[PDB]
Design an enzyme around this catalytic site. Structure first.
Site, short mmCIF file in Angstrom:
data_model
loop_
_atom_site.label_atom_id
_atom_site.label_comp_id
_atom_site.label_asym_id
_atom_site.label_seq_id
_atom_site.Cartn_x
_atom_site.Cartn_y
_atom_site.Cartn_z
N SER B 1 0.84 -1.23 0.00
CA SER B 1 0.00 0.00 0.00
C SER B 1 0.87 1.26 0.00
O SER B 1 1.98 1.26 0.53
CB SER B 1 -0.90 0.01 1.24
OG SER B 1 -1.71 -1.16 1.31
N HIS B 23 -2.85 -1.87 -1.13
CA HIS B 23 -2.47 -3.00 -1.96
C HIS B 23 -2.82 -4.28 -1.21
O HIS B 23 -2.31 -4.53 -0.12
CB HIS B 23 -0.96 -2.99 -2.25
CG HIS B 23 -0.51 -1.83 -3.08
ND1 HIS B 23 0.80 -1.41 -3.10
CD2 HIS B 23 -1.19 -1.00 -3.90
CE1 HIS B 23 0.91 -0.36 -3.91
NE2 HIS B 23 -0.29 -0.10 -4.40
N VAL B 70 -0.11 -0.88 5.88
CA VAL B 70 0.34 -1.83 6.89
C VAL B 70 1.68 -1.43 7.51
O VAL B 70 2.63 -1.11 6.79
CB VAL B 70 0.48 -3.25 6.27
CG1 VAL B 70 1.28 -4.16 7.20
CG2 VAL B 70 -0.91 -3.84 6.03
N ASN B 244 4.71 1.17 3.34
CA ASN B 244 5.01 -0.03 4.13
C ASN B 244 6.43 -0.05 4.69
O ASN B 244 6.82 -0.99 5.38
CB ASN B 244 4.78 -1.30 3.30
CG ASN B 244 3.35 -1.42 2.79
OD1 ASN B 244 3.12 -1.78 1.64
ND2 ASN B 244 2.38 -1.12 3.65
N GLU B 455 -2.75 -2.74 -6.95
CA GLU B 455 -3.73 -1.66 -7.02
C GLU B 455 -5.14 -2.24 -6.85
O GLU B 455 -5.51 -3.18 -7.54
CB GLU B 455 -3.65 -0.94 -8.37
CG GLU B 455 -2.28 -0.35 -8.72
CD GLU B 455 -1.86 0.78 -7.80
OE1 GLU B 455 -2.52 1.84 -7.81
OE2 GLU B 455 -0.87 0.61 -7.06
#
Lengths: 153, 521
Positions: B1, B23, B70, B244, B455
């Site tokens: 992400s 993501h 995350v 991330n 995506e």
């Protein structure tokens, strides 16, 4: 000075050409109900399956392929903790959770032929089920995965 | 992400910009995102969230918006237990297991069920499990006493001000995730969020592995308040980001360093090339318009190539194998972008799989190691060119085995296929440097591969008055059997043709195609 906010006078869902729901409610619970309704129409089969798993009844409803997760959730007391968390919600928010579940049940009741046969046994769902799935996703999928504990990658 | 938040001073029009870009798997059910819009007389929220959740995690409205990525917050500890005398050894004594006798039903193939017993045991740490190898492990999960995660998100996304937003965030009911915020007032913020146990010793690696379950020395009981976690608000750089990567380069210049926090909160491992790209794309650009902001989101640079081809090409041209020389010249002529028409990209990925491992995260092959002092320009170089050329030799064979040739068009093999829609792919693996991500699957018998992750929900918002936002959902807004809204957006995704997100009543009424009136009590 933001633009003036819209004040709904009736409950309605306006869907666009891509299946995106614009839910208008006269109050909070009404909006959550419409949202549950919309989610059921768009992702009902999987949502019901997941709520079933969060109850610790995956093995019961669908067999061996769901047994490991059932053992993981029951051993970590997810279903019961969800009931406690549900009971610990503020009155107002619990009302929104109930409405959300009500919306899911209503869609299913109005369109029984659109709910996959295998997940019909899950209905009706409750506000506690909603809390249970969110609890599972956050704490027992994201934070603590069965793979890391069982050392199974 | 990915996640970007840009302050007014860094934009052309003076309005904050926000990028929502999670993501996740394109197939895992509980990871499926759903786009929606809720409006009542007292609040409004637009955005995506995982199916089954009653609150929108990636939301925005006329005043504010947030996004998540995350951070892998270590909110749980797996303890190795020492079994003895019907209990477990703890602080030199045998402690008894707490245990209830439960039972559950197991559905049989014929539709009936059988009853199966289930003993649930718990040590002072938490529930006990037994691994296949026989290891006894007790798992201790933090925040089991935090019932307000859903309401916290709800209060966060409907906050009337940044102060109210922080007040809600501070409740510590959301156990994980990096969270980025932006509003029409001009405030931007990055928060390394979660419920982190307070420990007196041990770094993150220690706490992520099996911790000794025979000592109270490792049994934590408290968690950190929001103010103890890495956070950034309106930094001098004018932006915040997170792809991330550990929270050590959330903005540029940085506002804190690893030494300012407990060593168990986050890793100090090398930042991925995608994360390095994120920082460069933001820091290196100014006077940003929403349009330019969106164009930058499509970045798909083979950063790994920039770090390795300078050394690899010359070394490969030494080899007498005409095929290796050909491959080197093909890689040398490549613009190092993951475009649909790239004939060198597939071969490069195959070489990279060997040079940096299957996940492309290996560091052993580089000449100059990653350094927090040069966070966006290291690691670099090929440590052992000769060995790297042997890897290229093998990669050539692997590319032919998978795709049928070493120069097959990237977008001919990489396809996005949903139902009957089959369109060309572009962009790729994040660890190779691609900011826009499409984690391509292994190819099939025809050498065709599709995204397994990447995506999903993508949206860019400018907090002007009224707000202006665009977005797309890779796999549509529905996955119900027979729906016409599963494959109806992927063609636009293949052309980066974003939809204008409609929040104003007038806009919605103009685009509505179906109405569902209802009532509730």
């Amino acid at each position: 000075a933001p633009i003036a906010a819209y004040k709904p006078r009736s409950n309605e869902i306006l869907w666009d050409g891509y299946g995106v729901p614009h839910i208008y409610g006269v109050d909070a619970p009404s909006a959550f109900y419409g949202y549950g309704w919309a989610q059921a129409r768009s992702h009902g089969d999987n949502i019901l399956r997941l709520y079933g798993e969060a109850r610790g009844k995956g093995a019961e409803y669908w067999g061996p392929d769901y047994e490991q997760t059932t053992v993981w959730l029951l051993t970590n007391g997810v279903p019961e903790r969800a009931q406690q968390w549900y009971a610990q919600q503020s009155p107002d928010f619990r009302a929104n959770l109930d409405a959300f579940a009500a919306g899911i049940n209503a869609y299913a009741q109005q369109n029984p032929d659109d709910i996959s046969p295998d997940v019909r046994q899950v209905l009706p769902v409750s506000g506690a089920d909603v809390v249970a799935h969110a609890h599972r996703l956050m704490n027992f999928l994201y934070v603590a995965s069965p793979g890391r504990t069982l050392g199974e990658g | 992400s990915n996640s970007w938040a840009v302050a007014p001073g860094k934009t052309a029009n003076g309005n904050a910009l926000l990028l929502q870009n999670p993501h996740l798997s394109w197939t895992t059910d509980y990871f499926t995102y759903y786009e929606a819009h809720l409006v009542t007389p007292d609040f409004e929220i637009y955005g995506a969230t995982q199916i089954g959740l009653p609150v929108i995690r990636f939301a925005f409205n006329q005043r504010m918006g947030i996004t998540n990525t995350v951070n892998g917050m270590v909110g749980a500890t797996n303890y190795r237990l020492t079994l003895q005398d019907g209990g477990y050894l703890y602080d030199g004594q045998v402690r008894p297991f707490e245990r209830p006798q439960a039972s559950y039903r197991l559905r049989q193939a014929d539709g009936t069920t059988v009853d199966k017993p289930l003993e649930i045991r718990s040590s002072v740490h938490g529930p006990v499990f037994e691994r296949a190898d026989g290891t006894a492990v007790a798992v201790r999960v933090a925040g089991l006493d935090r019932p307000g995660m859903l309401e916290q998100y709800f209060d966060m996304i409907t906050a009337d001000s940044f102060d109210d937003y922080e007040a809600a965030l501070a409740r510590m009911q959301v156990p994980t995730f990096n969270i980025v915020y932006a509003d029409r007032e001009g405030t931007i913020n990055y928060s390394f969020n979660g419920v982190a146990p307070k420990r007196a010793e041990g770094d993150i690696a220690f706490w992520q592995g099996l911790v000794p379950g025979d000592s109270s020395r490792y049994l934590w009981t408290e968690t950190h308040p929001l103010d103890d976690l890495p956070r950034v608000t309106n930094p001098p750089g004018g932006f915040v980001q997170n792809s991330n990567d550990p929270p050590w380069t959330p903005t540029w210049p940085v506002t804190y360093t690893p030494k300012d926090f407990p060593s168990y909160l986050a890793p100090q491992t090398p930042h991925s090339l995608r994360a390095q790209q994120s920082v460069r794309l933001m820091s290196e650009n100014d006077d940003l318009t929403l349009e330019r902001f969106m164009a930058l989101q499509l970045s798909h640079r083979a950063v790994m190539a920039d770090r390795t081809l300078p050394d690899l090409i010359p070394a490969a041209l030494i080899d007498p194998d005409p095929e290796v020389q050909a491959a080197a010249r093909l890689l040398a002529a490549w613009d190092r972008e993951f475009t649909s028409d790239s004939r060198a990209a597939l071969l490069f990925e195959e070489w990279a799989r060997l040079f940096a491992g299957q996940n492309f995260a290996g560091q052993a092959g580089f000449a100059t190691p990653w350094s927090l002092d040069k966070p966006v320009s290291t690691p670099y170089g090929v440590r052992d060119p000769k060995a790297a050329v042997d890897q290229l030799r093998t990669a050539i064979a692997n590319t032919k085995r998978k795709y049928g040739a070493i120069d097959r068009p990237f977008g001919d093999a990489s396809r996005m296929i949903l139902n009957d829609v089959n369109v060309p792919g572009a962009a790729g693996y994040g660890n190779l440097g691609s900011f826009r991500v499409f984690t391509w699957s292994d190819p099939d018998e025809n050498g065709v591969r599709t995204p397994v992750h990447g995506e999903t929900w993508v949206a860019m918002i400018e907090f002007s008055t009224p707000v202006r936002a665009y977005g797309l959902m890779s796999y549509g807004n529905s996955r119900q059997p027979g729906t016409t809204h599963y494959s109806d957006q992927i063609e636009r995704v293949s052309r980066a043709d974003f939809r204008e997100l409609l929040l104003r009543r007038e806009q919605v009424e103009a685009a509505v195609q179906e109405r569902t009136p209802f009532n509730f009590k």
